[PDB]
Structures are given as C-alpha cells and as structure tokens.
Design a protein around this ligand. Structure first.
Ligand SMILES: [Zn+2]
Length: 56
RNA sequence: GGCGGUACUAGUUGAGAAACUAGCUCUGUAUCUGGCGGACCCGUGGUGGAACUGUGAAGUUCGGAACACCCGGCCGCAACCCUGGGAGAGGUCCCAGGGUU
C-alpha cells in the first residue's frame, strides 16, 4: 500500500498534584480524617434561619 | 478561627478634633482536583499462593492453577472544555461527538 499514516511526534510532561491530597484527606477543607464527599462543609437544605419584616 | 468595611465600646496620645491600638458588631466572605454508584464483561491489573522441608533465612513439593479483597477500564450520571456548521448590524444561538472527572 505504502503511504497510510505516520508522524511519530514526541510530547510528554504531565506532573501535577492536588495539594498533596492524601487517601485519608479532604479535598475540600484539606482536613485529614474524612473525604471531600464526606466534608462537613458540604452545604444542603433545608435552610437555616428565616428573615421577616413588618412595616418599613 | 482570620480578615476587610461600618459604627460603637475601651485604652493611650492629645488642648483639639483627630491618630493609633485593642475589643467587637454586623456585613460579607472564601474550598468537593482522589468523582460516586452499576453491572460483573475483559486484563491474572494489584496485592495475601497452599501445604511441606528447615535452628534460620530460603527453599521444596504441590498447583504451575485455584480463591479472596481491592483494582482499572467499562457503563449511568452532572460539571468543564475542544470541534463544527450556518444566519446574525459584532461574537448571539442551537444542537450533536469526545476526552477527563
Ligand atoms: Zn472536609
């Protein structure tokens, strides 16, 4: 056949870290003990307090 | 907890407002990159072979494999982006594909 495909191009370099994330660390608060999916910061309803006004 | 703006409160300085510091109020804030489940398909991917020999390590024989738990991809999902097309009084739209999580 000859002539089908070819290039052979070098391209490397993928060194990146996640704040030295640990298998026992949190990727949210950076706290060690729980996981991000278990971060106590994870907000969620219902809502806390409730506003209310009258004549103003 | 920390800081900034606000006012006030205290202390100091000062004649002076004002300056500074501290206290604090409110106000506001700032982070899920390792993705999570699902099924159970593929790779012996990872790790602990089993007994036996032996003071000890190490081996040996067995099987030459098995199992188990995890593992990756993989699928379902949402997020982000690359890519394109065409018209539109200037970058609007709509929609599909992939990768990664
Ligand atoms: Zn956390």
């Amino acid at each position: 056949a000859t002539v089908v495909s070819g290039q052979k191009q070098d391209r490397q370099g993928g060194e990146r870290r996640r704040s030295q994330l640990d298998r026992d660390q949190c990727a949210y608060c950076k706290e060690k003990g729980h996981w991000a999916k278990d971060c106590p910061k994870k907000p969620r309803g219902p809502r806390g307090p409730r506003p209310q006004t009258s004549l103003l």
